[PDB]
Amino acid sequence: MVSLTFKNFKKEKVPLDLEPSNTILETKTKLAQSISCEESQIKLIYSGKVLQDSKTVSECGLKDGDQVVFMVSQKKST
């Protein structure tokens, strides 16, 4: 049970909890349903690194209570 913090450019943190098996794909999905955003626009930055959808918290290097930098991109409205 690892707890993390997703921070954006709005200086706001969105606490979350995942599993070593859960991967960005899912964190992105949830983080999307949490703020009501989409994973297809969200970018998960780890220590200044644009994570991928095929990485697992275990491979991303995320641990318990860590923090993940992120940002939401424009909506399909374009």
Helices and strands in order, then pairings?
Layout: E1 2-7, E2 13-18, H1 24-35, E3 42-45, H2 57-60, E4 68-72
Parallel strand pairs: 1-4
Antiparallel strand pairs: 1-2, 3-4
Widest sheet: strand order? 2-1-4-3
Rg (C-alpha, Å): 12 Å
**Percentage of residues in DSSP E strands:** 25-35%
CATH topology: Ubiquitin-like (UB roll)
What is the CATH superfamily label? Answer: Phosphatidylinositol 3-kinase Catalytic Subunit, Chain A, domain 1
> What is the number of helical segments per DSSP (H or I, 4+ residues)?
2
Domain Ubiquitin-like: 1-77
Subunit structure: Interacts directly with PNG1.
Organism: Saccharomyces cerevisiae (strain ATCC 204508 / S288c) (Baker's yeast)
Subcellular location: Nucleus; Cytoplasm
Summary of the model, kept short:
This is UV excision repair protein RAD23. With about 80 residues, the protein is of the alpha+beta class.
Structure, described:
This protein is α+β, with helices and mostly antiparallel strands. It has one domain (1-78): Ubiquitin-like (UB roll) (Roll), CATH 3.10.20. The protein is built from 2 helices and 4 strands; from the N terminus they run E-E-H-E-H-E. The protein has helices at residues 24-35, 57-60, and strands at residues 2-7, 13-18, 42-45, 68-72. It has a 4-stranded mixed beta sheet with strand order 2-1-4-3, with helices on one face. The protein is globular, with a radius of gyration of 12 Å. This is UV excision repair protein RAD23. It is found in: Nucleus; Cytoplasm. Interacts directly with PNG1. There is a cross-link at residue 49 (Glycyl lysine isopeptide (Lys-Gly) (interchain with G-Cter in ubiquitin)). It comes from Saccharomyces cerevisiae (strain ATCC 204508 / S288c) (Baker's yeast).
